[PDB]
Amino acid sequence: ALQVANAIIGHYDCTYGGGAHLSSPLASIAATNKLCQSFQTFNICYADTGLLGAHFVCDHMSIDDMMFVLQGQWMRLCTSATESEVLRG
Amino acid sequence: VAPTLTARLYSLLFRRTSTFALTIVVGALFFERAFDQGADAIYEHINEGKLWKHIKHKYENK
């Protein structure tokens, strides 16, 4: 399920053809507003623990916006994931 | 295999925002009653026999 969740938020980089039309809200906002050069969610596993999160690369003036949208997306999945975005993931 | 009080208070009351608020509403109405009754008792005891409510019986019948 975490992998599905991470697929919903996805990854992104300035060379993606999708742009404003990308399904992931984070990727879409990032592209239209030029919030980052790139980002990727990740789920690094170890025996009984791991790191579940994301990494992003951006201009010095976009860090706060990136963080805001990224966390807003985690929060939206916790309380409001939709069947259709989940099927997509 | 057993939690602590705070862990239980966390899970059932504080975690959800809707429930963290109901907890405060309820706690506030309960605290108000207990605090006012308690403080009023302390004040009246410190001043036993001096307040109108303490000597009133002597004049009442009205």
């Binding site: 309380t79 409001s80 939709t82 | 809707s18 429930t19 608020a21 109901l22 509403v25 309820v26 109405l29």
Partner: peptide, 22 residues
């Protein structure tokens, strides 16, 4: 979605508040 359950505890709050507060 979660909005009914949330709108239902938000409902309650307002109610309890008025009841009490007022």
């Amino acid at each position: 979605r979660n909005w009914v359950p949330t709108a239902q505890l938000w409902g309650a709050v307002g109610a309890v508040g008025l009841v009490s507060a007022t």
